[PDB]
Design a protein around this ligand. Structure first.
Ligand SMILES: Nc1ncnc2c1ncn2[C@@H]1O[C@H](COP(=O)(O)OP(=O)(O)OP(=O)(O)O)[C@@H](O)[C@H]1O
Ligand SMILES: Nc1ncnc2c1ncn2[C@@H]1O[C@H](COP(=O)(O)OP(=O)(O)OP(=O)(O)O)[C@@H](O)[C@H]1O
Ligand SMILES: Nc1ncnc2c1ncn2[C@@H]1O[C@H](COP(=O)(O)OP(=O)(O)OP(=O)(O)O)[C@@H](O)[C@H]1O
Lengths: 278, 50, 50, 55, 353, 154, 220, 188
């Protein structure tokens, strides 16, 4: 007799009911990334027939890149509170084991619980691990699990079409990803995380200042101007550093002084008088 | 109606065809096995790389 | 099903892959987890069909 | 004649295909097969032992 | 005489063979349980009547019968390498008072480490998240490992030390998943302090794609990175990282979260040099006539380790003079000469930021 | 069950090969049935087992388990199945109605597909038959429902 | 009162029965100590320990039987017989072959009388090695910390190698020949484990002397 | 066919000799000695066995790192094996048979003489140099213009007195997958 389904094996499913951390009200800066992701995730998941009406085949391919800043998993935590679906949280390296015979069953199990519990969303973090090519026998199991990445690449062809799956993907470095993965027909969407900008500066300052105590002396004009001459950044974590320089004290509410201090702490370097060209 | 064959191809064209070699021969042995066949250069067309 | 179970109970049955055939009626058979073997006729299946 | 109906019972029916590792002047040959296995083989038949050579 | 017969009767109980360990996957029904041995094979089997279905739960380490392949007794958890990681011994206490510089660096780490544990209430009021990581690097100067190690023995509580050689694991770089084990028992035994030394070997940048194991290490990162980008609360646990240079750490580890703070070691100031000199003059025997400032002025730019090596060399020069009490004149001899030789061997000491 | 007997090991010099009335010996040693079973032919020999009746208590022992499915008064759970006879049984008949639409519109393509494959080569799909269980459950429904006019009336 | 000899007879007969389970402590396995009690569900209490194998399998067995939990922290090399899965004795120490013992140097044939002109600089070499041995009693009084590593370098010759080795016969301390590039191996983590294993038996053979060459090659 | 007839007809004695020593699998490297009777041994099967030895082999003949045969049933030591390392790289390193005798010299006198006395004379008359020693030199270095590279060695091939010598090609030392050259250079 066969598996019910689905009793696994491994991972497992669920574990996400007592989670996630916070809703999507946190990150309000992007707004151009969410319009892509929301339309590429929750809309195809809610109405499958609406796409068939207009005659457009909704892709399952979601690609993210650009860090820093981090972006990425924050969106997974948001979409977790938007819709009720089954979420897979797995580390790129988590399935690699001592025996290659477990790989194919594992990816198959992920997918078969996905189709049984559909609607469902699967998130693997930084698959660029298994995207690198090697020929040795010791990496021969790594080659087998990248042919397993190709085997799930075949299984998602099994998902074509209609019911069902959702695959979101992120990586710190996209230069190591093989063109077969980014090829259209499987991942049709490439979303790049942009560097924070002025519009995003004021949003990234509002969101951190709501959670932490603020002072009337503290003004965001010079903080959206002077750091905007270079950064860039990471800006949020420097505001967190203003919290961490308030917790260096012995302080009631943070003032302008600690912010100005967090700038000169971490990090800037010059680098260079050679820049005297401009 | 002839078969369509692309050049490398990554990674997995090398493993599927032999272990290791000139790589232009064993592949050509597959094209000899199935004829007619068309060979295509895919792709390495980029500004990278310019 | 009982008798057939008895013949498949001890060793079951393997899955063979022929790497090469020999003129001595013995055919080279390779198993994936295992090494390369070779086994004789096998009269039910003709040699030219292998 | 009778030798063909004799030596066949010794090798068959199943047999494995290994690789030769090294030869000893005692006619014991050290063979290596999948995966990482060794042994002492001494046979006086069909050899051709000098033309084999390890590898 | 009879105690021996007690042991021999114990052998009669040793006639019962052991069992095979296995993890509980799921249960199809009350007569069907899916278990997986550590070896890789899976088995759907039953269970006896002593165990409770609710107490079992999936992902539980249990022992399977040699033949029936069914659960008899269970264990909550086990881990074989960690016991070694909990046996590190740091003297001081006193050694913590003898390190001297850098004072204000110590006053930063004392807080970022100790305060979140003793006063978690102050953080929740302001809304500031306690830093879950910190970076201490050298050797522009020295004292990295010493200072942090002293905190292990000062704060007491729990401490865990990991040598960078445990990541390879030869074939099957599963030690990456041994990081998940590490953080498992870090979530159990919390609070705890974790040290990471020579991270540059295990946190490199995979700039030039090559060889083989270059990639496996990149996969060990993914365990660190994803567990510190969680999906997990590391607030209670603490981690310390050290390197020769922050060149290989990638934008991943130079980013906050994983590494919130960064404290570079600096060359000992002459004022701090007097201090560190003082703590090494204590155990040593000298003449009643002593002047430390001569040494401070003569010794500039040296490492706190190199100062101690110079003091010891001053003493190791006195044994040739065989004298019990040793004047600082002989000291300034050995000091000046040998230390300056250290400057000749000081080539390529300049390290990046 | 099973049964065994220890043969004497010191008899190994004399004839070890009885018995008389070899009938039951032949049926007992069979089937052989693997290897481990045959590994006990030496040093051991089995011995036949046959039930005896004791048919009186066996007769009641059948009727105890069979009557277990039956009710105590016998008019209780059948009339509770008469309370069931209209529940949610009109809704359970809507369950059967969905099985009869959904399985039949895909089993009406099978007579056309038989012309494509020509004819009954493998196959199966499936999605095939399953209407037997639907008819049997509907027949249980109509019979337990026919009990209404018998029970409710007098 | 004479029945004590009867029980003596049964404990010796059972010891002879222990001999058949003591032959032979064939396989090597790794140990994980554990102590737990299992409530039911009349009561059953004790201690049970987890065991590894050399065949990649990991078993579960009651605590040995014979040697108690007085020793030790999770170890290895424990002798256990085939499918019995019982450890009769815990056998030391560590491992393995050339990794256990890099090189066994009895003594070099050369002595310090075969060199000349180094009298000034041979004294600094002889000092760092000889002074810790005999004068420890002096160092405890003077608070002196002995040197450990010494950097000897130059083009041949010099001839540092022969002199450094020759003085090791005069100190009687155990000498372990080690080459730098030996740390490089076909597989990963070998050099790390190798150094740990090197100072292991150095602590067992203490005092001793370990020498390496071409450090510049493996320390770039 | 006659030689193969007698070749295949020796299997009747071969099968009687096939009962012993055919269970000698496999070759295993030893580890440490705890006592005299008992030795810990490792095998490529990955199972490390601690076992005794057969009474037909003197225990004093087994030294740490010696590979020995095993009777898998009893696991006891059967027979030691002198050869250990290495696969085919060694046999490729070995050369045999002479060629290019001394009559192939192109007139070089002092050259060929001074290199003759470094190699051929010490092994031609060993007692001579040991008597009058001092000590023969370690070796030589050849280089310069191409004529005549590498042929002068062929002279030592044909002038080799008894035991053949081994020639080695340079580029085979450096190989992909670093760490192969370490084993390489050591074993030879
Ligand atoms: N509003 C915000 N804008 C940008 N970054 C934020 C914001 N809020 C939190 N973060 C940062 O995002 C981090 C967590 O993001 P995530 O879990 O996606 O990491 P990641 O993107 O996987 O890491 P990396 O990209 O460096 O591998 C936190 O450390 C926090 O500093
Ligand atoms: N502040 C200090 N007080 C006392 N001793 C010190 C101090 N700093 C360094 N030392 C000496 O230096 C030795 C090593 O300490 P530390 O961890 O700083 O070295 P390290 O960081 O490994 O040096 P490097 O980074 O150059 O390898 C100790 O044995 C100690 O005696
Ligand atoms: N200054 C010296 N005094 C005495 N003997 C010397 C001196 N220099 C060289 N020799 C002799 O030269 C011989 C060759 O030694 P060599 O210099 O090659 O060794 P080495 O340089 O120590 O080797 P390595 O380079 O591996 O360290 C030695 O036998 C040594 O006795």
């Amino acid at each position: 007799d066969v598996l019910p389904p689905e009793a696994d094996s491994s991972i497992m499913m669920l574990t996400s009911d007592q989670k996630p951390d916070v809703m999507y009200a946190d990150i309000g800066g992007m707004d151009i990334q969410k319009q892509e992701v929301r339309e590429a995730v929750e809309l195809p998941l809610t109405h499958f027939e609406l796409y068939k009406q207009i005659g457009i085949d909704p892709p399952r391919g979601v690609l993210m890149y650009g860090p820093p800043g981090c972006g990425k998993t924050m969106l997974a935590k948001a979409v977790a509170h938007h819709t009720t679906a089954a979420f897979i949280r797995v580390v790129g390296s988590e399935f690699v084991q001592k025996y290659l015979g477990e790989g194919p069953r594992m990816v198959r199990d992920v997918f078969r619980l996905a189709k049984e519990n559909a609607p469902a969303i699967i998130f693997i973090d930084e698959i660029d691990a298994i995207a690198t090519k090697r020929f040795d026998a010791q990496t021969g199991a790594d080659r087998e699990v990248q042919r397993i990445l190709l085997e799930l690449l075949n299984q998602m062809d099994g998902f074509d079409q209609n019911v069902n799956v959702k695959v979101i993907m992120a990586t710190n470095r996209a230069d190591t990803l093989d063109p077969a993965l980014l090829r259209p027909g499987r991942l049709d969407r490439k979303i790049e995380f942009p560097l924070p900008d002025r519009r995003q500066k004021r949003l990234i300052f509002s969101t951190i200042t709501s959670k932490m105590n603020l002072s009337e002396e503290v003004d965001l004009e010079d903080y959206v101007a002077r750091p905007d001459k270079i950064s860039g950044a990471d800006i949020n974590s420097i505001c967190q550093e203003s919290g961490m320089l308030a917790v260096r004290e012995n302080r009631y509410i943070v003032l302008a002084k600690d912010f100005e201090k967090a700038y000169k702490t971490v990090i800037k370097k010059d680098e260079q008088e050679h820049e005297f060209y401009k | 109606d002839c078969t369509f064959i692309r050049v490398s191809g990554s990674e997995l064209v090398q493993k599927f065809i032999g272990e290791g070699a000139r790589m232009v021969r064993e592949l050509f042995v597959m094209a000899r096995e199935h004829a007619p066949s068309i060979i295509f250069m895919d792709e390495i067309d980029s500004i990278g790389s310019s | 099903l009982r008798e057939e179970l008895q013949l498949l109970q001890e060793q079951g049955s393997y899955v063979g892959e022929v790497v090469r055939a020999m003129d001595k009626k013995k055919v080279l058979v390779k198993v994936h987890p295992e090494g390369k073997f070779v086994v004789d006729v096998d009269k039910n299946i003709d040699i030219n069909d292998v | 004649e009778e030798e063909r109906s004799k030596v066949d019972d010794l090798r068959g029916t199943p047999m494995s295909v290994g690789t030769l590792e090294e030869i000893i002047d005692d006619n014991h040959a050290i063979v290596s097969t999948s995966v990482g296995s060794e042994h002492y083989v001494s046979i006086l038949s069909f050899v051709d032992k000098d033309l084999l050579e390890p590898g | 005489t009879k105690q021996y017969e007690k042991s021999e009767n114990d052998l009669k109980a040793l006639q019962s063979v052991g069992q095979i360990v296995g993890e509980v996957l799921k249960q199809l029904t009350e007569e069907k349980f899916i278990v997986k041995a550590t070896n890789g094979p899976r088995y759907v089997v039953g269970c006896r009547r002593q165990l409770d279905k609710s107490k079992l739960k999936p992902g539980t380490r249990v022992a399977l019968d040699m033949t029936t392949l069914t659960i008899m007794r269970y264990l909550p958890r086990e881990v074989d390498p960690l016991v070694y990681n909990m046996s590190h011994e740091d003297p001081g206490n006193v050694s913590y008072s003898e390190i001297g510089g850098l004072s204000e660096q110590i006053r930063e780490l004392r807080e970022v480490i100790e305060l979140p544990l003793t006063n978690p209430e102050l953080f929740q009021r302001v809304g500031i998240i306690p830093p879950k990581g910190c970076l201490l690097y050298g050797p522009p100067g020295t004292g990295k490992t010493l200072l942090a190690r002293a905190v292990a023995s000062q704060l007491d509580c729990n401490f865990l030390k990991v040598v960078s050689s445990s990541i390879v694991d030869k074939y099957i770089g599963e030690s990456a998943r041994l990081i998940r084990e590490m953080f498992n028992y870090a979530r159990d035994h919390q609070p705890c302090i974790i040290f990471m030394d020579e991270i540059d070997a295990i946190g490199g940048r995979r700039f030039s794609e090559g060889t083989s194991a270059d990639r496996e290490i990149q996969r060990t990162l993914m365990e660190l990175l994803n567990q510190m980008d969680g999906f997990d609360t590391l607030h209670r646990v603490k981690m310390i990282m050290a390197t020769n240079r922050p060149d290989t750490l990638d934008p991943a580890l130079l980013r906050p979260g994983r590494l919130d703070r960064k404290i570079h070691i600096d060359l000992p100031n002459e004022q701090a040099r007097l201090d560190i000199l003082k703590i090494h003059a204590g155990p040593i025997t000298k003449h009643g006539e002593i002047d430390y400032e001569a040494i401070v002025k003569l010794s500039d730019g040296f490492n706190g380790a190199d100062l101690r090596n110079v003091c010891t060399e001053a003493g190791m020069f006195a044994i040739r003079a065989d004298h019990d009490f040793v004047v600082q004149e002989d000291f300034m001899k050995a000091v000046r000469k040998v230390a300056d030789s250290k400057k000749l061997e000081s080539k390529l000491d300049y390290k990046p930021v | 069950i099973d049964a065994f007997r220890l043969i004497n090991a010191n008899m190994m010099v004399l004839g070890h090969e009885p018995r008389q009335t070899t009938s039951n010996l032949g049926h007992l040693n069979k089937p052989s049935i693997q290897a481990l079973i045959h590994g006990l032919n030496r040093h051991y020999y089995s011995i036949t087992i046959n039930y005896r009746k004791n048919e009186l208590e066996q007769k009641m022992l059948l009727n105890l388990h069979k009557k277990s499915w039956m009710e105590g008064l016998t008019l209780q759970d059948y009339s509770e199945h008469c309370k069931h006879n209209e529940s949610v049984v009109k809704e359970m008949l809507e369950l059967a109605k969905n099985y009869n639409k959904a399985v039949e519109e895909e089993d009406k393509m099978t007579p056309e597909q038989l012309a494509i494959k020509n004819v009954g080569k493998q196959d199966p799909k499936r999605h095939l038959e399953e209407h037997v269980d639907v008819l049997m459950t509907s027949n249980i429904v109509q019979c337990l429902a026919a009990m209404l006019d018998t029970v409710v009336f007098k | 009162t004479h029945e004590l000899q009867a029980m003596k007879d049964k404990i010796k007969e059972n010891s002879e029965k222990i001999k058949v389970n003591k032959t032979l402590p064939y396989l090597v396995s790794n140990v994980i100590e554990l102590l737990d009690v299992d409530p039911n569900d009349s009561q059953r209490k004790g201690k049970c320990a987890v065991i590894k194998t050399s065949t990649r399998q990991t078993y579960f067995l009651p605590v040995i039987g014979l040697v108690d939990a007085e020793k030790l922290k999770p170890g290895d090399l424990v002798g256990v017989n085939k499918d019995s899965y019982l450890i009769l004795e815990t056998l030391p120490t560590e491992y393995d072959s050339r990794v256990k013992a890099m090189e066994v140097d009895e003594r070099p044939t050369e002595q310090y009388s075969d060199i000349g002109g180094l009298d000034k600089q041979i004294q600094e070499l002889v000092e760092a090695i000889v002074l810790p041995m005999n004068h420890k009693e002096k160092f405890e009084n003077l608070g002196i910390q002995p040197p450990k590593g010494v950097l000897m370098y130059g083009p041949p010759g010099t001839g540092k190698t022969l002199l450094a080795r020759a003085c090791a016969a005069q100190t009687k301390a155990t000498f372990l020949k080690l080459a730098g590039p030996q740390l490089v191996q076909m597989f990963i983590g070998d050099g790390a484990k190798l150094v740990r294993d090197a100072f292991a038996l150095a602590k067992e053979k203490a005092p001793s002397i370990i020498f390496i060459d071409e450090l510049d090659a493996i320390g770039t | 066919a006659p030689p193969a007839l007698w070749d295949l007809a020796a299997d009747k004695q071969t099968l009687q000799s096939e009962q012993p020593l055919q269970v000698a699998r496999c070759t295993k490297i030893i580890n440490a000695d705890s006592e005299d009777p008992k030795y810990i041994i490792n095998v490529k099967q990955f199972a490390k066995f601690v076992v005794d030895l057969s009474d037909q082999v003197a225990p004093t003949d087994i030294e740490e790192g010696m590979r020995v045969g095993v009777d898998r049933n009893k696991y006891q030591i059967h027979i030691p094996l002198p050869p250990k390392i290495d696969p085919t790289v060694t046999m490729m390193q070995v050369e045999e048979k002479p060629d290019v005798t001394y009559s192939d010299v192109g007139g070089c006198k002092e050259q060929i003489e001074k290199l003759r006395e470094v190699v051929e004379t010490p092994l031609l008359h060993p007692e001579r140099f040991v008597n009058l020693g001092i000590e023969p030199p370690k070796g030589v270095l050849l280089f310069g213009p191409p004529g005549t590279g590498k042929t002068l060695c062929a002279r030592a091939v044909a002038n080799r007195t008894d035991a053949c010598f081994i020639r080695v090609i340079g580029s085979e030392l450096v190989q992909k997958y670093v760490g192969e050259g370490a084993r390489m250079v050591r074993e030879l």
